[PDB]
Amino acid sequence: YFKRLSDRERAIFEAGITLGAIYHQFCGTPVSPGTAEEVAKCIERAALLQPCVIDARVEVDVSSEDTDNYGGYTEVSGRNLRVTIVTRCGEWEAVGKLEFIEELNYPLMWVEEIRRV
Amino acid sequence: YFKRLSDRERAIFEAGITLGAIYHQFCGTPVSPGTAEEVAKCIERAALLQPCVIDARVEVDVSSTDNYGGYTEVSGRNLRVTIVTRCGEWEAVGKLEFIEELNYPLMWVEEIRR
Amino acid sequence: LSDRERAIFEAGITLGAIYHQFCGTPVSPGTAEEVAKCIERAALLQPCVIDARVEVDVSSEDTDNYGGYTEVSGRNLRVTIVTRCGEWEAVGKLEFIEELNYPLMWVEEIRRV
Amino acid sequence: YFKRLSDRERAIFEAGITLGAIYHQFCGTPVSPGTAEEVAKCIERAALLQPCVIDARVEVDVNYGGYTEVSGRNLRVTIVTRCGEWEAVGKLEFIEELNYPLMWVEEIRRV
Ligand SMILES: [Mg+2]
Ligand SMILES: [Mg+2]
């Protein structure tokens, strides 16, 4: 109510929120090699508006072999989307990552680092 | 799949498809007055990839976001879209805009033209 | 738009809206029918839609990964919708077409009631 | 990937992921009074597939088109995540004084 989380905990909470939000808002977005940098930037800028987010790095890894289809384009998906987000509440930073992990066959979300400033 | 569909008909159909897709793909995107043009631009470029789409003009109309998070969301209240589809010799002008009188973001066709 | 043109436009709107509203939804083999039905019901609220049939085609192999689930996508999602505006109907379809490597949307049929 | 992350903090991370995912997957979904229960059920079932999610309760509290959409205004959610011996209860609800749909953790508790 609504302040039970210490801010280390909040930094972890907000990294989780931003990773899930980014993934679900943007997966499905039509994208090409020519687009894919500008889309990545809009995603970062959208992530940087969320509570406690102080850094967002997004890559949408698309190549022309991904656009060999009637449409001539592909979509943002767990397969081509990679995100690092840094969150800071008070003196604590958390580092959240999204990346398709081949061995897991799955776009994993994890906490890379939790860090006192 | 398009053996009997006219180009005129496809222009209309693709404008509908593109407007539904934009709306549902981008509604809920965190936005602020400072993002809002760049968000518009990525929406445009995403639109321009889809079949028959030869033009797209988007605005996200966001003012000074007074709330806890300090931002708003792309929605039917703030999203304005005009797209032009061209299939063969036919163009449709498709539009999306909140129509104050109906209380709803309306999608419509402004013009169909050769 | 005349009623016939409205029938086509609304079918395109509904396919586009459904595809991008629902893709990314987590789904498993026995999810897969309740999700399909949720999609039908949302399609039925759109102007002119009078029939919606949705299949979400997921097998245990699609779910052979760390999470144990998959997501609704261009590859597993099939939709037929029927629009009626006034005296005219349009049948709109969505399906992954292998030869095209693409989830194509198209008009199967335009016909008088 | 989780060698150094405590299960307590994983429970918190996953709650956050699931609330953000729910919110952004489903906002925009056409809904009406007769929709609105069944929609909530599809959301819970979608939420329940996610890592560590063991419980999900959703309400959708419902012009030209004759319908409305799942939004931050009408969507309410409580999830329980369980990782190892720890549980977090995550909430999403519109808070009037904040004029914002807040996501927050209501409690973290031992199993
Ligand atoms: Mg939305
Ligand atoms: Mg999606």
UniProtKB/Swiss-Prot annotation, chain A:
It is an enzyme of class 4 (lyase). One of its GO terms (biological process) is tetrahydromethanopterin biosynthetic process. Substrate binds at residues 14, 109. Keywords: Lyase. InterPro entries: DHN_aldolase_MptD (IPR027508), MptD_sf (IPR036839), MtpD_C (IPR007181). One of its GO terms (molecular function) is dihydroneopterin aldolase activity. Pathway: Cofactor biosynthesis; 5,6,7,8-tetrahydromethanopterin biosynthesis. Its EC number is 4.1.2.25. It catalyses: 7,8-dihydroneopterin = 6-hydroxymethyl-7,8-dihydropterin + glycolaldehyde. It holds the Pfam family DHNA. Catalyzes the conversion of 7,8-dihydroneopterin (H2Neo) to 6-hydroxymethyl-7,8-dihydropterin (6-HMD). Homotetramer. Belongs to the archaeal dihydroneopterin aldolase family. HAMAP family: DHNA_arch. This is Dihydroneopterin aldolase. It comes from Methanopyrus kandleri (strain AV19 / DSM 6324 / JCM 9639 / NBRC 100938). The gene is mptD.
